[PDB]
Amino acid sequence: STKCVTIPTEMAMCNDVGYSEMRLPNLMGHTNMAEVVPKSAEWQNLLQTGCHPYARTFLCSLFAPVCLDTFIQPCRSMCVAVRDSCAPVLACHGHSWPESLDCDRFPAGEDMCLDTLSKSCQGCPLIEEFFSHKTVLEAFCDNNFAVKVKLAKKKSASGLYEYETEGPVEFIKQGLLLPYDTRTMIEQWLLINENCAQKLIRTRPTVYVIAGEIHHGKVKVNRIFHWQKKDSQLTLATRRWRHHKCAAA
Ligand SMILES: [Cl-]
Ligand SMILES: [Cl-]
Ligand SMILES: [Cl-]
Ligand SMILES: [Cl-]
Ligand SMILES: [Cl-]
Ligand SMILES: [Cl-]
Ligand SMILES: [Cl-]
Ligand SMILES: [Cl-]
Ligand SMILES: [Cl-]
């Protein structure tokens, strides 16, 4: 029916939250630790960002409720705070706030609940057209990656529009990742920023030089340079990048 188990060291989410014994089944419905531990480990990437100081203990009140006490849910206030602070980070990871954590399921008003002690990647930069290769090189130095990509619009079976890279991607500045991983992050950014991709399709030709940052599986495009058919400045900047000395080391 129900039992109490020791929080294992392998459960990094709740191995240092003030108590060592949890009750099963937990508030998430998990009936055994072979289910509790991996499902809790799915939150590790979000929790390592520090999106909200109460995210970890809020989650542990659900995944590892206190053994000897009756089940007390966290307050809807704390759910709304943690959700409003951490949901954009999950969106940057490509995820969304789970329906199982819909804050409307948590108590408010008279119902007793555990409360608090007290009371980014979505940017779409402009398409730069008349620019200097010195500005392009400055963007290269200021960003993690810089690539030459051709974008293409495509109609799916359901009638919706998909935006994809077409042909090979010419890498100018690789950054600290392999070109395969960088390109995978660029595709992820294209899917997450559908409005920005749609904006980029409207400028012909659809060839761009994009520069941005990649941090812990999050991709942010900072600069977008349009590659004209008779381009000179992007050509000069890309040919110069190999021998270019940045202003900062
Ligand atoms: Cl969001
Ligand atoms: Cl973020
Ligand atoms: Cl970011
Ligand atoms: Cl624009
Ligand atoms: Cl920049
Ligand atoms: Cl189309
Ligand atoms: Cl870098
Ligand atoms: Cl054209
Ligand atoms: Cl043109």
| DSSP assigned state of 159 | S
- Going by C-alpha positions, the residue among 120, 59, 55 that lies closest to residue 93 is 120
Nearest ligand, measured from the Cα of 153: 6
The answer to whether the Cα torsion of 149, 141, 173, 213 is positive or negative is negative
CA–CA gap between residue 55 and residue 186 (Å, rounded): 29
Q: Based on the number of CB atoms within 10 Å of its own CB, is 25 exposed (0-12), middle (13-18) or buried (19 or more)? A: middle
| Count of the separate structural domains present in the chain | 2
C-alpha of residue 26 to centroid of ligand 3, in Å: 33
Same domain for 241 and 191: yes
Kindly provide the resolution of this structure in angstroms, with one decimal.
2.1
Residues with Cβ < 8 Å from 149, sequence gap 6 or more?
165, 169, 170, 186, 207, 208, 209, 210
- Going by C-alpha positions, the residue among 2, 31, 33 that lies closest to residue 13 is 33
C-alpha of residue 176 to centroid of ligand 7, in Å: 6
Q: Residue 178 is part of which domain span?
A: 120-249
Same domain for 237 and 162: yes
Nearest ligand, measured from the Cα of 208: 9
C-alpha of residue 124 to centroid of ligand 4, in Å: 9
Distance of CA 73 to the CA centre of its chain: 28
The span from the first CA to the last CA of the chain, in angstroms, equals: 62
C-alpha of residue 215 to centroid of ligand 1, in Å: 18
Last residue of a domain, one of 119, 137, 162: 119
Residues with Cβ < 8 Å from 99, sequence gap 6 or more?
none
- Going by C-alpha positions, the residue among 54, 56, 62, 58 that lies closest to residue 24 is 62
CA–CA gap between residue 191 and residue 211 (Å, rounded): 17
Which ranges constitute the DSSP H helices of 21-75?
Answer: 33-41, 44-47, 55-63
C-alpha of residue 221 to centroid of ligand 5, in Å: 9
C-alpha of residue 32 to centroid of ligand 2, in Å: 32
Neighbours of ion ligand 6 (CB under 5 A): 155
At 133, list the tokens.
């290769």
Task: Please state how this structure was obtained.
Answer: X-ray
| DSSP assigned state of 178 | -
Same domain for 1 and 93: yes
